[PDB]
Amino acid sequence: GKLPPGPRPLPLLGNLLQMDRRGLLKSFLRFREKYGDVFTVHLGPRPVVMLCGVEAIREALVDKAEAFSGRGKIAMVDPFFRGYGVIFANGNRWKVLRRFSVTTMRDFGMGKRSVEERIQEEAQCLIEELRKSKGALMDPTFLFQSITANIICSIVFGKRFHYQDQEFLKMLNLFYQTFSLISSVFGQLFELFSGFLKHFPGAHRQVYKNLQEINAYIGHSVEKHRETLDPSAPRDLIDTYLLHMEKEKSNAHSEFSHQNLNLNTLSLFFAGTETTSTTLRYGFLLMLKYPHVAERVYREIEQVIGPHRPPELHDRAKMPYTEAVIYEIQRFSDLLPMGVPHIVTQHTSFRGYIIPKDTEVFLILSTALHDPHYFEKPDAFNPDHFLDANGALKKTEAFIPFSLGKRICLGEGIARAELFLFFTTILQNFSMASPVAPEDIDLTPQECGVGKIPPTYQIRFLPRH
Numbered sequence: 001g002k003l004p005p006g007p008r009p010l011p012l013l014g015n016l017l018q019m020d021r022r023g024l025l026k027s028f029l030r031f032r033e034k035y036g037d038v039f040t041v042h043l044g045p046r047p048v049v050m051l052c053g054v055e056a057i058r059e060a061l062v063d064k065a066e067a068f069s070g071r072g073k074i075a076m077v078d079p080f081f082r083g084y085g086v087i088f089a090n091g092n093r094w095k096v097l098r099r100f101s102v103t104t105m106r107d108f109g110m111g112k113r114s115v116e117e118r119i120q121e122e123a124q125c126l127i128e129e130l131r132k133s134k135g136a137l138m139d140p141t142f143l144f145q146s147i148t149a150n151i152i153c154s155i156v157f158g159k160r161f162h163y164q165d166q167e168f169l170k171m172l173n174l175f176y177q178t179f180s181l182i183s184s185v186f187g188q189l190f191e192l193f194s195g196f197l198k199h200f201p202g203a204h205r206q207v208y209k210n211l212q213e214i215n216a217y218i219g220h221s222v223e224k225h226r227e228t229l230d231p232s233a234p235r236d237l238i239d240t241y242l243l244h245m246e247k248e249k250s251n252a253h254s255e256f257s258h259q260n261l262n263l264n265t266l267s268l269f270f271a272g273t274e275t276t277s278t279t280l281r282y283g284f285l286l287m288l289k290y291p292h293v294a295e296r297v298y299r300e301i302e303q304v305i306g307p308h309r310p311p312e313l314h315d316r317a318k319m320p321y322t323e324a325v326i327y328e329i330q331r332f333s334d335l336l337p338m339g340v341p342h343i344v345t346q347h348t349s350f351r352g353y354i355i356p357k358d359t360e361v362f363l364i365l366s367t368a369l370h371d372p373h374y375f376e377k378p379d380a381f382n383p384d385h386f387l388d389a390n391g392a393l394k395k396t397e398a399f400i401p402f403s404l405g406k407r408i409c410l411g412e413g414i415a416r417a418e419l420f421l422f423f424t425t426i427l428q429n430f431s432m433a434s435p436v437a438p439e440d441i442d443l444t445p446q447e448c449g450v451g452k453i454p455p456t457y458q459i460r461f462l463p464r465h
């Protein structure tokens with residue numbers, strides 16, 4: 001047939017006057033109830049196919065990966081990245097780079113210090129800092145952003161930064177800033193009417209500016225790296241890349257070397273940004289609303305790890321309640337209700353509809369995370385959602401906060417490690433508190449733009465002896 005069905009569009013407004021205010025996703029859900037799991041929405045002049053439910057998403061990224069493994073455009077930032085980097089690249093440029101980063105993560109810490117090892121130290125760093133607090137009320141946004149960044153700085157640069165380092169705090173704010181700029185009213189509108197709306201200055205000019213600045217730091221650092229390279233003792237991800245380049249220069253067709261080192265790197269920071277920090281931020285609001293969940297976790301830790309030695313990844317298996325409490329957190333948080341845009345690469349038949357080469361496509365993962373067929377009463381927080389009768393860990397087809405298929409999250413490994421190690425280590429050492437009663441805690445996500453973001457909150461961490 002043709003493009004899946006959906007609301008009657010206007011000429012260059014598409015379906016935009018029909019949306020909700022300001023529950024965009026909430027709009028998408030109203031269309032769902034009218035059109036099914038496979039509708040088309042005209043976001044401005046552009047046609048975008050939406051897909052809901054596990055079956056649909058899976059049919060597309062897994063069953064039909066030949067077609068649906070494209071990355072869709074993101075106007076606010078494509079003028080900078082220009083197609084470079086794992087999250088942004090398509091075709092051969094991506095296939096070549098995805099592979100390299102994959103093998104590099106796989107073999108990292110083979111020679112040098114392991115990712116776990118890095119997370120553990122950041123963790124211990126974190127706790128001292130949290131203790132230095134002396135049980136004071138704080139907003140932890142800053143720190144969580146810090147620790148997550150640090151882990152990627154550790155991987156890529158071979159080092160972490162002191163939480164007070166100003167060179168650091170500046171760089172950080174530059175990211176956060178760039179993000180909320182794309183999250184804004186404008187960045188939204190820029191993504192639509194960029195065709196004409198790029199001439200004028202906007203937040204897009206500012207965003208390039210901010211990305212350019214950060215990029216200066218990466219180029220500088222790559223140089224410092226070329227000047228201290230030991231071919232037989234790679235310290236970091238940079239060191240590994242630069243080496244790949246040389247062995248690569250002795251080929252004939254280095255698709256790899258024709259690529260912008262800096263951007264690739266920046267893009268990796270971008271990807272991992274605002275990622276875990278948000279989840280963790282959400283995590284501890286939840287532990288304030290459900291303290292009895294917090295206490296149980298602690299007890300498991302005390303039971304399995306005890307009060308002194310640093311939790312480690314191996315503990316995971318033996319701690320199913322915690323792995324469940326973490327899973328439910330991710331599920332409930334719905335970081336990216338809509339994934340990251342895809343485009344289809346070949347013309348394709350999907351549920352007897354005909355989708356054209358180059359159509360943008362959204363996998364609405366919120367709908368998988370909230371499938372009442374897999375999660376009883378899905379709008380509430382419940383770890384049990386990942387436990388059986390026994391209380392053994394219960395994994396499901398539906399928990400795909402990381403998407404599925406070829407483009408599936410590059411940092412899942414890393415991500416899951418962070419969440420565990422940070423979550424347990426904090427909790428090993430501190431109980432939580434807040435001026436606000438559990439039953440007064442508002443969980444309502446901000447849903448500002450394309451991400452879900454928890455409301456802001458005061459928290460204090462409390463030591464145990």
Ligand code: HEM
Pocket residue numbers: 086087098268271272273275276279335336339340363401402403404406407408409410411412414415
């Ligand atoms: C809780 C944190 C995270 C979540 C929920 C998450 C989820 C996702 C999702 C949904 C995608 C898009 C996949 C798709 O197209 O369906 C993705 C892609 C990606 N993520 Fe994450 N991610 C997280 C953290 C990270 C981190 C820390 C990194 C840093 C290494 C990262 C790096 C990437 C990269 C590089 C891609 C694109 C790779 C590719 O497209 O081939 N993610 N992630």
Ligand SMILES: CCOC(=O)C1=C(COCCN)NC(C)=C(C(=O)OC)[C@H]1c1ccccc1Cl
Pocket residue numbers: 074087179180182183270271272273274275339340341409449450451
């Ligand atoms: C293509 C890069 O997008 C990301 O990496 C995002 C991220 C980064 O994590 C996604 C990578 N796993 N999260 C956030 C917060 C995003 C956002 O737009 O917040 C306003 C998204 C995001 C940022 C910029 C543009 C689009 C999106 Cl979805």
Ligand SMILES: CCOC(=O)C1=C(COCCN)NC(C)=C(C(=O)OC)[C@H]1c1ccccc1Cl
Pocket residue numbers: 024025043073074075182187188189191192338339341449450451
């Ligand atoms: C492609 C057009 O961009 C938008 O209109 C968006 C919008 C539309 O904003 C409507 C404001 N009236 N917001 C959301 C949620 C976006 C998003 O990516 O969430 C997944 C962004 C968005 C959608 C698709 C691709 C990129 C972005 Cl930034």
